[PDB]
Amino acid sequence: ARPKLYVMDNGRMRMDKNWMIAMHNPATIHNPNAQTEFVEFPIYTVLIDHPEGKILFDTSCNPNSMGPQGRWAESTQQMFPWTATEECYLHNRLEQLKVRPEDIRYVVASHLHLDHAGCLEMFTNATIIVHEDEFNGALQCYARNQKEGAYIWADIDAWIKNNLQWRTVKRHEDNILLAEGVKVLNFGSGHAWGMLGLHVELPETGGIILASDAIYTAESYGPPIKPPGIIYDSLGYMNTVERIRRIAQETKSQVWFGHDAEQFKKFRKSTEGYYE
Amino acid sequence: ARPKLYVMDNGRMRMDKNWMIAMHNPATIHNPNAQTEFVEFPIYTVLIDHPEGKILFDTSCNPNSMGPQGRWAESTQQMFPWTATEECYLHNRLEQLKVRPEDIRYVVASHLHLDHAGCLEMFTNATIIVHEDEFNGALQCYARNQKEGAYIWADIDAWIKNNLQWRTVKRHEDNILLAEGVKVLNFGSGHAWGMLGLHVELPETGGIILASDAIYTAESYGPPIKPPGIIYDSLGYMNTVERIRRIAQETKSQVWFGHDAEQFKKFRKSTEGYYE
Ligand SMILES: CCCCCCCC(=O)N[C@@H](CCO)C(=O)O
Ligand SMILES: CCCCCCCC(=O)N[C@@H](CCO)C(=O)O
Ligand SMILES: [Co+2]
Ligand SMILES: [Co+2]
Ligand SMILES: [Fe+3]
Ligand SMILES: [Fe+3]
């Protein structure tokens, strides 16, 4: 198999750096009212154009997220603002590659946060691969009518109305061979209820791990590890980063972080080419 | 048994409120450089004068913690400054009750942080009850020569030189009857590697849960729960708070928080009296 892997730029988000790096600048007797900063980072998605069928990793934010008529609650829009030109929307990035939503055989949802699961509703011809614990947690947010936080009610509403086809990865489930040189990694609980990664083996480029929010940035990754400011499972988070470090060492793979502005700058994006 | 329980005031600490309440005031598009606060809170200890023998819960900070010749690293003194008059030192609070260090039969160390294990070295005639996972973690900090952070090298150094007598609570160990109406609760990992609480049943006052840093304040406790800015085991922390809530409900017990300024103000301290 001679796949082509594309990095698609789906715009920029800002938030409190304390979300990204917990207690990054603690108050002191000399700086008792210490200030945070509002840091900018990329949202992106990965397309694997594979002869056995097209695989998409993450789906970015819904085009209807922001604004007075937006799906995102006003508090969410103010703490986690997303900025994107029309060329950044996932449907346009895919159209520029001559890829219609119906051509996607698999969507791997790293997790179901607003900045990863925003366009799942497009992929009505795919199998949506998601962690069972992540799916359960998001569906409880929906059933409880939660309007704030990182699980977007109107996104989930659209997944159910559009009759998406789900394959849940079970809590103790091995790492799933999707296609030649493409493996779903079950990271389990950490950043969210259930995290999935991807291990891709390309003939030219060699190994790539897509970590998504298992590892926000190179600063998260250290060593030593700098965890995020809120976390579902701190122990699982720390175990997941060290497991990724060991897999990268043993397989000589690059690690692609979820939201690293400096790493993302260096990628070849879908407007310039691809990785074989 | 007709015990007397004393609350001893061991002075005041300040730190970034984000340590106390994770992401208490997140940056927004309108407040992108949001300021934290440097909040003040009590350090205290509990003496149970029991006919079966005196039980101490926690030991506050070492009198030699602060200052240019202090045991605390300079970064620790600046992020977690302790202020205490000599009357606040545990040795003096106990002397004012005519209690010598040698009169303590049991010391329950909730955990081994700087603000709880600072005077263990005084209690050479006691059995020191500690969670096995907390002891292991602190002893690794000692062995790796760590000088910064919440585990004070020079305090651990004095515990070993003074030949303290340890009883470790094992990870799966039940809740230990120390004396009539005094039970050690094994909370397990959460805030730190291994947390112990106390459930005291007094004839007049009824039930008291000493939670220590399993629950910092009433704001932590909610509901809903507001976790602290850094945590060893987030899942264990959240389970521990709900377990304490259920025990309080099923036994009609008061919950005494680790560091709640408003609750502490309402306690009768060792200069005014005691609880029977
Ligand atoms: C009201 C509290 C909001 C919930 C905090 C978690 C939201 C979050 O972490 N959102 C994004 C930030 C970008 O990574 C994510 O983690 O994927
Ligand atoms: C160098 C970073 C310090 C480690 C952060 C945890 C220290 C901590 O939480 N210390 C005290 C704060 C007062 O409760 C404690 O939890 O007992
Ligand atoms: Co996320
Ligand atoms: Co503590
Ligand atoms: Fe994210
Ligand atoms: Fe404390």
Author numbering:
A (entry chain F), B (entry chain X): 8 to 283
Paper text:
MLLs degrade N-acyl-L-homoserine lactones (AHLs), molecules that are used in a microbial communication system called quorum sensing (QS) to coordinate a variety of behaviors, including virulence and biofilm formation. We provide the structural and biochemical analysis of the lactonase GcL (WP_017434252.1), isolated from the thermophilic bacteria Parageobacillus caldoxylosilyticus. GcL is a thermostable, highly proficient lactonase with broad substrate specificity (kcat/KM values range between 104 to 106 M–1 s–1) for substrates such as N-butyryl (C4) L-homoserine lactone (HSL) and N-decanoyl (C10)-HSL. The binuclear center, common to all MLLs, is coordinated by five histidine residues and two aspartic acid residues.
We solved the structure of GcL in complex with AHL-hydrolytic products bound to the active site through cocrystallization with C8-HSL. While the model of GcL in complex with the hydrolytic product of C8-HSL is limited in its accuracy by a relatively low ligand occupancy (∼0.7), it reveals that the negative charge of the hydrolytic product carboxylate group is stabilized by the bimetallic active site center, and that the alcohol group interacts with the α-metal (iron; 2.7 Å; monomer L). In addition, the carboxylate group of the C8-HSL product is positioned between the two metal cations, 2 Å from the cobalt cation and 2.8 Å from the iron cation (monomer L). The other oxygen atom of the carboxylate is hydrogen bonded to the hydroxyl group of Tyr223 (2.7 Å). During lactone hydrolysis, the protonation of the leaving alcoholate group may be an important, catalytically limiting step. The position of the alcohol group is 3.3 and 3.5 Å from Asp122 and Tyr223, respectively. This suggests that the side chains of Tyr223 and Asp122 are possible acid catalysts for the reaction, although a protonated Asp122 side chain (protonated in the first reaction step) would be expected to have a more favorable pKa to fulfill the role of an acid catalyst.
